[PDB]
Amino acid sequence: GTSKLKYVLQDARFFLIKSNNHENVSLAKAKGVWSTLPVNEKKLNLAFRSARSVILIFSVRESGKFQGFARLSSESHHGGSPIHWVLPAGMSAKMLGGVFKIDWICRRELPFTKSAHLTNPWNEHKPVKIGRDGQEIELECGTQLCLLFPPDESIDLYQVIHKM
Ligand SMILES: CNc1nc(Cl)nc2c1ncn2Cc1cccc(C(N)=O)c1
């Protein structure tokens, strides 16, 4: 069902994550980690303390889709085997230092064509697919967007609710 999902999304904050390549999103799904640029890293650390759930909604650039969504389980931390991110033109690897742990809520795709009726007040009411990496999505639009994804029956939200 969707009752536990709605509970997790209750009073959550939502952020759009734009990745330049599929390889890093695949790595994030396999390992439960994400790294972003320092400007967005600071925003996510502040949000993590402020909200019962912080949700990252992922979209690979030029894919025309979202690839899933996940909940932050930690603030960013440095120190660990450098994740073997595929670095775009000038990512320095030092800018992708700072690793957040995430718990996937949905690893299924959603095409942008399915979200065309959702606009984001925090980005001038443009369609929610439009936005830069780290753009915050207002609560009602973010909740609706997450509910549009196909159910991911491989995920049990029971352990996620306990992190809360
Ligand atoms: C593992 N984390 C990531 N992996 C990849 Cl492949 N792309 C990411 C990313 N995080 C943000 N992006 C998008 C991006 C790429 C280069 C420059 C900017 C800029 N704002 O100038 C933004």
Concatenating the DSSP letter of every residue in 5-44 gives HHHHHTT-EEEEEEES-HHHHHHHHHHTEE---HHHHHHH
Name the DSSP class of 63: S
Name the DSSP class of 3: H
Experimental method: X-ray
First and final C-alpha spacing in the chain: 20
- Taking CA atoms only, the protein residue closest to ligand 1 atom 6 is 20
CB-based contacts of 54: which residues, under 8 Å, 6+ apart? 12, 13, 14, 15, 44, 47, 48, 71, 72
Resolution, in Å, please?
1.4
- Taking CA atoms only, the protein residue closest to ligand 1 atom 12 is 19
Q: Smallest Cα–Cα separation from 14: which of 162, 138, 152?
A: 138
Q: Which domains does the chain have, with CATH numbers?
A: 1-164 (3.10.590.10)
Q: What is the rounded distance in angstroms from the CA atom of residue 149 to the CA atom of residue 60?
A: 16
Provide the annotated binding site for RNA: 18-20, 34-35, 85, 133
Minimum-distance ligand 1 atom for the alpha carbon of 27: 1
